[PDB]
C-alpha cells in the first residue's frame, strides 16, 4: 500500500500576488 | 495498491492574482 | 490496482484573476 | 485494473477571470 | 479493464469569464 | 474492455461568458 | 504502508508577494 | 509504517516579500 | 514506526523580506 | 519509535531582512 | 524512544539583518 | 529514552546584524 | 533518561554586531 | 538521570562587537 | 543524578569588543 | 419551494458523470 | 426556500464525478 | 433561506470527485 | 440565511476530493 | 447570517482532500 | 455574523488535507 | 462579528494538515 | 469583533500541522 | 477588539506544529 | 484592544513547537 | 492596549519550544 | 500600554525553551 | 508604559531556558 | 516608564537559565 | 524612569544562573 502525497499550494489575498511557476515532479517505480 | 496523489492548487481573493503557469509531471511505472 | 490521481485547480473570487496556463502530464506504463 | 485520474478545473466568481489555456496530456500504454 | 479518466472543466458566475481554449489530448494504445 | 473517458465541459451563469474554443483529441489504437 | 508527505506552501496578504518558483521532487522506489 | 514529513512554508504580510525559490528533495527507498 | 520531521519556515512582516532559497534534503532508507 | 525533529526558522519584522539560504540535511537509516 | 531535537533559529527586528546561511546536519542511525 | 537538545539561536535588534553562518552537527547512534 | 543540553546563543542591540560563525558538535552514543 | 548543561553565550550593546567563533564540543557516552 | 554545569559568557558594552574564540569541551562518561 | 438534485450509486456500481446543476429561486 | 444537492455513494461502490453546483437564492 | 451541499461516502466506498460549490444568497 | 457545505466520510471509506466552496452572503 | 463548512472523518476512514473555503459576509 | 470552519477527525481515523480558509467580514 | 477556525483531533487519531487561515474584519 | 483560531488535540492523539494564522482587525 | 490564538494539548497527546501567528490591530 | 497567544500543555503531554508570534498594535 | 504571550506547562508535562515573541505598541 | 510575557512551569513539570522576547513601546 | 517579563518555576519543577529579553521604551 | 524583569524560583524547585536582559529607556 | 531586575530564590530552592543585565537610561 504505497501512497505518496505531495501538496503544492499558492494563495494570496488583499492586494497580493504570486509570480513563480509550479513545476513539481513525483516519481514512483 | 498504488495510489500516488499530487495536489497543485492556486487561488486568490480580494484584488489578487497569480501569474505562474502550472506544469506538474507524474511518472508511474 | 493502479490509481494515480493528479489535481490541477485554479480559482479566484472578488476582483481576482489567474494568467498562467495549465499543462499537466501524466505517464502510466 | 488501471484507472488514471486527471482533474483540470478552472472557475471564478464575483468579477474574476482566467486567461490561461488548458492543455493536459495523458499517456497510457 | 483500462479506464483512463480526464476531466477538463471551466465555469464561472456573477460577472466572470474564461478566455483560454480547451485542448486536451488522451493517448491509449 | 477498453473504455477511455474524456469530459470537456464549459458552463456559466449570471452575466458570465466563455470565449475559448473546444478542441479535444482522443486517440485509441 | 509507506506514506511520505511533502508540503510546499506559499501565501501572502496585505500588499505582499512571492517571486520564487516551486520545484519539489519526491522519489519513492 | 514509514511516514517522513517535510514542511516547506513561506509567508509574508504587511508590505513584505519572499524572493528565494523552493526546491526540496525527499528520498525514500 | 519511523517519523522524521523537518520544518523549514520563512516569514516576515512590516516592510521585511527574505532572499535566500529553501533547499532541504531528507534521506530515509 | 524514532522521531528526529529538526526546526529551521527565519523571520524578521519592522524593516529587517534575512539573506542566507536554508540548506538542512537529515539522515535516518 | 529516540527523539533528538535540533533548533536553528534566526530573527531580527527594527532595522536589522542576518547574512549567514543555515546548514545543519542531523545524523541518526 | 534519549533526548539530546541543541539550541542554536541568533537574533538582533535596533540597527544590528549577524554575519556568521550556522553549521551545527548532532550525532546520535 | 539521558538529556544533554547545549545552548549556543548570539544576540546584539543598539548598533552592534557578531561576526563569528556557530559550529557546535554534540556526540551521544 | 544524566543532564549535562553547557551554556555558550555572546552578546553586546551600544556600539560593540564580538569577532570570535563559537565551537563547543559535548561528549556523552 | 549527575548535572555538570559549564558557563562560558562573553559580553561588552559602550564601544567595546571581544576577539577570542569560545572552544569549551565537556566530557561525561 | 424545494429543489432536489440527487445522485445515488447503489452497491457494487459505478457512476462516472459529473454533477453540476444550476438552481435559481426567486 | 430550500435547495438540496446530494451525492450519495452506497457501500462497495465508486463515484468519480465532481460536485460543482451553482445556487442563487434571492 | 437554506442551501445544503452534502457529499456522503457510505461504508467500504470511494468518492474521488472534488467538492466546489458556489452559493449566492441575497 | 444559512449555508451548509458538509463532506462526510463514513466508516471504512476513502474520500479524495478537495473541499473548496465559495459562499457570498449579502 | 451563518456560514458552515464542515469536514467530518468517521472512524476507520481516510480523508485526503484539502479544506480551502472562501467566505464573504457583507 | 458568524463564520465557522471546522475540521473534525473521529477516532481511529486520518485526515491529511491542510486547513487554509479565507474569511472576509465587513 | 465572530470568526471561528477550529481543528479538532479526536482520540486515537492523526491530523497532519497545517492550519493557516486568513481573517479580515473591518 | 472576536477572532478565534483553536487547535485542540484530544487524548491519545497526534497533531503535526503548524499553526500560522494571519488576523487583521481594523 | 479581541484576537485569540490557542493551542491546547490534552492529556497523553503530542503536538509538534510550531505556533507563529501574525496579529495586526489598528 | 487585547491580543492573546496561549500555549497550554495538559497533564502527561508533550508540546514541541516553538512559540514565536508577531503582534502589532497601533 | 494589552498584549499577552503565555506559555503554561501543566503538571507532569514537558514543553520544549522556545518562547521568542516580537511586540510593537505605538 | 502593557506588555506581558509570562512563562509558567507547573508542579512536577519541565520547561526547556529559552525566553527571549523583543518589546518596543513608543 | 509598563513592560513585564516574568519567569516563574512552581514547586517541584525545573526550568532550564535562559532569560534574555530586549526592552526599548521611548 | 517602568521595566520589570523578574525570575522567581518557588519552593523545592531548580532554575538554571542565566538572567541577562538589555533595557533601553530614552 | 525606573528599571528593576530582580532574582528571587524562594525557600528550599536553588538558582544557578548568573545575573548580568545592561541598563541604559538617557
Residue numbers in the entry:
A (entry chain I), B (entry chain M), C (entry chain Q), D (entry chain U), E (entry chain Y), F (entry chain 2), ...: 262 to 290
P (entry chain 3), Q (entry chain Z), R (entry chain V), S (entry chain R), T (entry chain N), U (entry chain J), ...: 265 to 290
Sentences from the paper on this structure:
TFG functions in the early secretory pathway by regulating the transport of secretory vesicles between the endoplasmic reticulum (ER) and ER–Golgi intermediate compartments (ERGICs). To perform its role in clustering vesicles, TFG self-assembles into homomeric cup-shaped octamers via interactions encoded in its N-terminal Phox and Bem1p (PB1) domain and a subsequent coiled-coil motif. Within this region is an LCD (residues 237–327) rich in proline, tyrosine, and glutamine that functions to further polymerize these octamers into larger assemblies and phase-separate. Mutations in the TFG LCD are associated with degenerative neurological disorders such as Charcot–Marie–Tooth disease type 2 (CMT2) and hereditary motor and sensory neuropathy with proximal dominant involvement (HMSN-P).
